[PDB]
Structure 1
Amino acid sequence: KYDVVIVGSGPIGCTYARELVGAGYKVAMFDIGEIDSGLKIGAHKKNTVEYQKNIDKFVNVIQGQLMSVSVPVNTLVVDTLSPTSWQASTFFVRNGSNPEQDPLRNLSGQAVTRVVGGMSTHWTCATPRFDREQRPLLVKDDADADDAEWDRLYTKAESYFQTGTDQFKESIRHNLVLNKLTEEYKGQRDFQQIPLAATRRSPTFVEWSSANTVFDLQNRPNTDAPEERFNLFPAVACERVVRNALNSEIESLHIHDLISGDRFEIKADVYVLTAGAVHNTQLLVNSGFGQLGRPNPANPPELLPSLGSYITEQSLVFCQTVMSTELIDSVKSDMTIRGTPGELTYSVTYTPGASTNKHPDWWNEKVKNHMMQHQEDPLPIPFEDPEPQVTTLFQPSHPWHTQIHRDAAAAGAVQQSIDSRLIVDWRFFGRTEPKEENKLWFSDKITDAYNMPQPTFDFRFPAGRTSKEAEDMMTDMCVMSAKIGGFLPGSLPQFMEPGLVLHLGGTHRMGFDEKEDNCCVNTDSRVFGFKNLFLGGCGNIPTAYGANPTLTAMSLAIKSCEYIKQNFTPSPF
């Protein structure tokens, strides 16, 4: 028996833990997955010297923990099998595909992660804010009020994630790309560092933030926190929240201890579900909210009708450019090169402090040193130059998020053929109109791996504004990217699998009124009608957004925690 129980040890799971644990509460937290990250629980897996030296190898780790949400029944024709081999006469349901799934209105890319820390053990760490136009109202009819609230809550999230914008100032390649872009857009567009949840430590190590940054996930009391009380129980599939008859209260959490196998009922005052857009939705439907099964309007549920509807996922376009000759030459514009590299007459010099220099002394000193010390190498960019983290944020006139940078690179010859210093990644993130017809539902007969109803997608991108904007977005990535250089073959402008972006929201969305705003939680993140049941995560966000949701989910989480603090006494220690 605890004051609060948290389902899920992700970054939002951990926002709720951080706030409540240090506010004197006794918190129990369960996660389906295990401690998967060394001695800092929930930590980013990319924080090891091996990876920061071999960053390309990291894409593999991501794919290791992205388990597909809904896979249609495969109908590929393999007809070169030996005549002695067994072949079915049908494409039967096999290797776990979901026979409810329409292969053509799916979010095939959608995946999930089961590991203490959630997808924060692997994430890229982009933590920007939403402007008014992507933002749910926390207050109605007082923009200034609303802005006050969001700034206060955002600033705390930024605090928790260790967000900053300075970690990459001393990269050449970063500065090359940011300056070129500013030049060009001549005050139509602000360019800047992607805000990133991380702290730098040497020129070659960054500590990427995570669930663990928010909250270190040690059992308490411990020596450093002898007054706090917290327990984390991994290897537990939470399955059901038990409803009172009045549908005013949750009375327990039914759990499955995957190690022992046995099941348990856990009692608490406050119930917080932070298990992710898909699984926050799945547990509530398994618990009698919403509607189990293929959705049926001639029989609409009376509890939380809007749940699992209005689901938004972002369109996502990608490509990679090989930096322009013009920009490589520009790097070395202050240098006075003579001789031919590798010969003994050869010298590169610059006049330090010179007011006619285009770059500062630090830059030029690196370019000189690299070129004199490595005459064999033909590019003026030093060897461990940090990589770019450029962005232009969402605006009315360009309603999409943009990251011009380097993440998860899976090397297929023409990306090892090209020198990686030349390569910059473009990803542009469109926004989607929340629409009732787009659903996440659960099968009343099919089950997934952990024995729960199988999730199923009825999603297509709304025609109209989302469709228009999404193709405008592509052409923009092509217009913008051309300025830094040509596409790198094997990474041509493309739209990515729907859902691969993993920015799903609106599955348990927020509003002021359940009915008029078609939603399941209030701006306190409480479920309508229920006194002690809160939801955390992107499931909450009701609006059309292009930017990365986590820092807004955490914002709403922090807001919810404050309701809790104002209405439930911690038990006495």
Structure 2
Amino acid sequence: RYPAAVDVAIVGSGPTASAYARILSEEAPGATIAMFEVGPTVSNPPGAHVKNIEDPDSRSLAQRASEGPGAGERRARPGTYLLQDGYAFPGEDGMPVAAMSSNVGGMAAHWTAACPRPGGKERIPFLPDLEELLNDADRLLGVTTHAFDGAPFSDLVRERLAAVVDQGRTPAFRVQPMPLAVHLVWSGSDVVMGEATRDNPQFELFDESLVTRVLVEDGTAAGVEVQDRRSGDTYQVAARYVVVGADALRTPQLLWASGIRPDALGRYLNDQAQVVFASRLRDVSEQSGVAWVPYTDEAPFHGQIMQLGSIVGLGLFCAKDLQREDRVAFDDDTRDSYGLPAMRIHYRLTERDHVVLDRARQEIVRLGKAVGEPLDERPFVLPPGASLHYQGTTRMGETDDGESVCSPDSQVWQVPGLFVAGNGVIPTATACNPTLTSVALAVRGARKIAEEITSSLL
């Protein structure tokens, strides 16, 4: 079913992995590419967003097909599934609501498209071209800030918030329309790989293909072992490069099972603590758009105010005090529904995490009162894992120091040719939506590969 060898093997079909296919497809048009996705194809084109399926019955089945092994408070959103066990532990908080997606497009086939920029200490210092890669991350995702201009309440919502937020802040950190990847139509991975990949003769996308191991020969990326999930037979596909973009949890799971077990892999896992709140405007689906209250080092929260349109939703996301004991561990002795080392989350909020969390509750209420009439009296704190923004599992670093898993170009240290993509590549304590940053990092690695493929003599 699969070829024998390719120039580049891509594990996963999320937005970051499809960015590698994108830049490679349009920058290295000659190389051969094999993208292997465990989950099925649930949209058209592959990776399209489910919200774009008109029929609400075709959309539900498209969602349950993405819930992987969970195809049968603590529950997951449609298109996602939770862990069987090992999420919470005694003496720790854990991520009871940490979810995943198994389908062509990844979670990019279910997200809400928010794509803000990092500010202050969110931005990655050792990247002097971050602003350039960020704009390319805009291009690939089809980001737009003017998706809700005619919207009647988007302007009023932004006005009331600015009166309570804009004091003393520079223009980049004032209230503004959230940059959205809205392609009335949502952007998935279908928009990232796009036509360049979809019309690339040397690119092939294999759903129902489980990558159970990254092959390495001579200490260098040698390929991948792919298990055809429709025949149960295990193949082996060679390649000069291997891109692993299977999300911040399963990516370290694949490397750990592959023998690539650096002491840093899976550690410094950080989740954005989410705080929900609602308010009712005072007056008389394009109706309100999305409002962005940027992050700042002095208020390490990220603010989303969306049209759910008199009633608006308020969510605040917290950057975390990164620690080593925040780690995704793996047990060889116990497999999971896919047959890989069962994972286990060691996650605990430090006192600094709570000092910020309760600050988010005080501030989201201030924002709720600024916009109008608060519904509930008290803001509700979502359990760890709800944000679905897991960073640091394969964090990036400027040099090798036992706490970075890859290089600034996403190239895993002890395994040349193996690149990692996704939220886990982020190393800094962030509060905004990472996907735009994850695509920016993925674009930097992809065009590092295209640089080497087209400049080599092989």
With the length of structure 1 as denominator, give the TM-score of the two structures. Answer: 0.71
2:342 to 445, 451, 454: 454
- Counterpart contact for 2:293–2:303, Cα < 8 Å: yes
Which letter does structure 1 place at the counterpart of 2:389? H
Matches of residues 518-533 of structure 1 in structure 2 within 5 Å? 518-533=403-418
> Is it true that 1:123 corresponds to 2:101 in the alignment?
no
Task: Give the Å deviation of 1:506.
Answer: 0.3
Superposed, 1:392-471 pairs within 5 Å as 392-407=293-308, 421-464=309-352, 466-471=353-358
CA distance 1:32–1:570, change in 2 (3 Å): farther
Please state if 1:197 is matched with 2:206.
no
Is the deviation greater in 258-267 or in 101-110? 101-110
Find out whether 1:305 has 2:280 as its counterpart: no
Superposition deviation, residue 452 in structure 1? 1.2
1:387 is aligned to: 288
Question: What do residues 265-285 of structure 1 show as CA deviations (whole Å, max 9, x unaligned)?
Answer: 110111110111011110000
* Partner secondary structure for residue 251 of structure 1: strand
Distance 1:547 1:33 in 2: 27
How many angstroms does 1:492 deviate by?
4.2
Which runs of 5 or more residues in structure 2 are unaligned? 67-75
Deviation at 1:322, TM superposition (A): 2.2
1:210 aligns with 2:97: no
CA distance in 2, matches of 1:279, 1:404: 31
Residues of 1 paired with 2:327 and 2:455: CA distance? 38
Cα pair 2:280 2:310 within 8 Å, conserved? yes
Is the partner of 2:334 in helix, strand or coil?
strand
Counterpart Cα distance in 2 of 1:217 and 1:232: 14
Question: Paired residue for 1:26?
Answer: 32
The Cα shift of 1:488 comes to: 2.2
Take 1:320 and 1:513, find their aligned partners in 2: how far apart are those partners?
44
For 1:260-279, list aligned pairs within 5 A: 260-279=231-250
Contact 1:487–1:493 (8 Å) recurs in 2 = no
SS of the counterpart of 2:51? Answer: coil
CA distances 1:197-250 after superposition (whole Å, capped 9, x unpaired): 113xxxxxx121111101148987xxxx4x631111100110111233x5x302
- Work out the CA distance in 2 between the residues paired with 1:251 and 1:186: 52
Distance of aligned partners of 1:570 and 1:27 in 2 relative to their CA distance in 1, 3 Å threshold: farther
Aligned equivalents of 1:569, 1:34: Cα separation in 2: 32
TM (normalized to structure 2)?
Answer: 0.89
Structure 1 residues 183, 273: closer, same or farther in 2, change over 3 A? same
Q: Percent identity?
A: 28
Give yes or no for contact 2:124–2:130 (8 Å, CA) kept in 1: no
- 2:77 alignment partner, SS class: helix
Specify the alignment match of 2:41 in structure 1.
Answer: 35
Q: Which has the larger radius of gyration?
A: 1
Contact 1:42 1:216 in 2 (8 A): no
Q: Are residues 1:66 and 2:50 paired?
A: no
Q: Are the structure 2 counterparts of residues 8 and 185 from structure 1 closer, same or farther at C-alpha, using a change threshold of 3 Å? A: closer
SS in 2 for 1:111: coil
What is the distance in 2 between the residues matched to 1:321 and 1:110?
A: 27
266, 280, 304: which one aligns with 1:322: 280
Question: Pairwise CA RMSD of aligned residues?
Answer: 2.6
SS at match of 1:426: strand
Shift in Å, 1:500:
1.1
Confirm or deny: 8 A CA contact 2:175 2:293 kept in the other structure. yes
Closer, same or farther: CA 514–467 of 1 in aligned 2, 3 Å: farther
For residues 118-157 of structure 1, what are the structure 2 equivalents within 5 Å? 118-139=106-127, 146=128, 149-157=129-137
- Equivalent residue letter for 2:177: Q
Partners of 1:242 and 1:136 in 2: CA distance:
30
Of 135, 154, 163 in structure 2, the residue corresponding to residue 183 of structure 1 is 163
Map of 2:204 onto structure 1: 231
Aligned residue identity for 1:26: T
**2:367 and 2:206 mapped to 1: Cα distance?**
47
Instruction: State how far apart, in whole Å, the 2-side matches of 1:255 and 1:152 are.
Output: 35
Task: Measure, in 1, the Cα distance between the counterparts of 2:240 and 2:372.
Answer: 57
Q: Following the alignment from structure 1 to structure 2, what is the Cα–Cα distance between the partners of residues 551 and 211?
A: 12
**Does structure 2 conserve the Cα–Cα contact (< 8 Å) formed by 1:192 and 1:391?**
yes
Q: Given the superposition, is the C-alpha separation of residues 396 and 443 from structure 1 closer, same or farther in structure 2, using an over 3 Å criterion?
A: same
Deviation at 1:100, TM superposition (A): 8.7
Equivalent residue, structure 2, for 1:2: 6
Aligned with 2:364 (options 447, 472, 477): 477
The CA deviation at 1:571 is 9.8
Matches within 5 A, 1:233-248: 233-244=206-217, 246=218, 248=219
Q: Deviations over 1:476-531 (max 9, x none)?
A: 00111112233324x84111010111110100111012216x11100011011322
Matched, 1:559 2:448: no
Number of paired residues? 435
Q: Equivalent residue of 1:284, what SS?
A: helix
